[PDB]
């Protein structure tokens, strides 16, 4: 249930469609009571590009919020505080430790739902100090992480994750360890690298029993989609296809199922057909990419590479048709693909055979040590010049 809030903030960000996404974004925060915070949250939504809030000076006020919702949430939050202060007065009369903690911890989560970060931290703080169930302890720290993922401030995500991360392993709860993977999984799509995310999702479908999560079916549909992006045919084949579990369950997947199947059949005509449509279909509805360039660039390298690895020669017609796009577009794409060194093929258009040399060799692994070393190398010089003054 709360994971959709996090996906929805993500959608105006997609460079593939700014406007439609705004209407997706509004829906779930209106129900939950984010209205009160939303005036402050709105500035983050501008970076993400457009917001349809009542106090928004953004382009789409076509699905603008009514004034009454802002006010209704605000009265509701004060009313909730009024009950709480009073609970607190009662608490001394019973046990100090039990009653004040239960109320303080409940107040924090409520504050977190709204997206008030400041009020959350303080309210939680007392509960941590005091004795409370180990499983409950891991769910409350995840809520502080959950506010930051909504907020889309990157620096903020880091702090919470590191703290939560120590407490999960210390604890006995396996089911809870899984919950953190999903929250972190949202984080992984949020940054440019999509690859990292798939693994968290594969684990979580098995174990993360429903509470703080959507229905089993809507989670499985996310699961297969993300698995396709990271994993090539051997990896995909063993992991998903081999299983007992899918046959027993029965499919409700066919659209996403075709995208997984095409890779295996190694017919890129079927692949590319599924790819133009799927990209638009899945990505817009729920976030797995605020940066559309990364997704297609990685899929296209794999679709070409895999066709080439298995078959030395092809005709231009087959090549044009299977890949989809123009011969002209294809010829530019290749040049970038070659640079990596894993593809290394030549194309004869004047003799109409596209040859693939295909060296599996030490050069491929060698290439990797040399390439990766560059980012780090540049970065220390910069750290050192700062530290010294």
């Amino acid at each position: 249930m709360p994971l959709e809030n996090l996906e929805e903030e993500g959608l105006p960000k997609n460079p593939d469609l700014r406007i439609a996404q705004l209407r997706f974004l509004l829906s779930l925060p209106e129900h939950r009571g984010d209205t009160a915070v939303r005036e402050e949250l709105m500035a983050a939504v501008r970076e993400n590009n457009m917001a349809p809030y009542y106090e928004a000076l953004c382009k789409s006020l076509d699905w603008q919020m009514d004034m009454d919702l802002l006010s209704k949430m605000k009265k509701a939050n004060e009313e909730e505080l009024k009950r709480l202060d009073e609970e607190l007065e009662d608490a001394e009369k019973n046990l100090g430790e039990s009653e004040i903690r239960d109320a303080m911890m409940a107040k924090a989560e409520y504050l977190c739902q709204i997206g008030d970060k400041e009020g959350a931290l303080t309210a939680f703080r007392k509960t941590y100090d005091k004795t409370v169930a180990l499983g409950h302890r891991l769910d409350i720290v995840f809520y502080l992480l959950r506010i930051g993922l909504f907020y889309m401030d990157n620096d903020l995500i880091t702090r919470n994750t590191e703290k939560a991360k120590s407490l999960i392993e210390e604890g006995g709860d396996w089911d809870r360890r899984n919950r953190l993977k999903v929250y972190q999984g949202l984080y992984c799509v949020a940054i440019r690298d999509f690859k990292q995310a798939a693994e968290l999702f594969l684990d979580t479908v098995s174990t993360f029993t429903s509470y703080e999560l959507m229905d089993y079916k809507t989670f499985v549909t996310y699961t297969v989609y993300v698995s396709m992006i990271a994993l090539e045919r051997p990896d995909l084949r063993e992991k998903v296809i081999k299983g007992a579990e899918i046959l027993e369950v029965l499919h409700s997947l066919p659209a996403v199922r075709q995208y997984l199947f095409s890779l295996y059949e190694c017919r890129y005509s079927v692949f590319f057909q599924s790819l133009a449509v799927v990209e638009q279909e899945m990505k817009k509805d729920w976030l797995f990419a605020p940066h559309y360039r990364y997704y297609v660039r990685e899929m296209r390298i794999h679709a070409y590479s895999q066709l080439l690895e298995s078959y030395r020669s092809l005709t231009l017609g087959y090549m044009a048709e299977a890949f989809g796009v123009g011969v002209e577009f294809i010829d530019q794409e290749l040049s970038r693909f070659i640079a990596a060194g894993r593809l290394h093929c030549k194309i004869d258009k004047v003799n109409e055979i596209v040859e693939t040399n295909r060296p599996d060799s030490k050069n491929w692994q060698y290439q990797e040590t040399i390439k990766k070393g560059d980012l780090l190398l540049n970065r220390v010089q910069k750290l050192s010049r700062v530290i010294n003054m």
Binding site: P15, D16, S269, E279, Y292, V296, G317, E321, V325
Partner: peptide, 24 residues
């Protein structure tokens, strides 16, 4: 680099259909 994603989705679906007729 350059934004390959906007251009590829539109091109891949459309071009491929003409290519079906043109070549195998």
């Amino acid at each position: 680099n350059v934004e390959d994603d906007f251009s590829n989705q539109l091109r891949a679906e459309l071009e491929k259909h003409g290519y079906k007729m043109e070549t195998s």
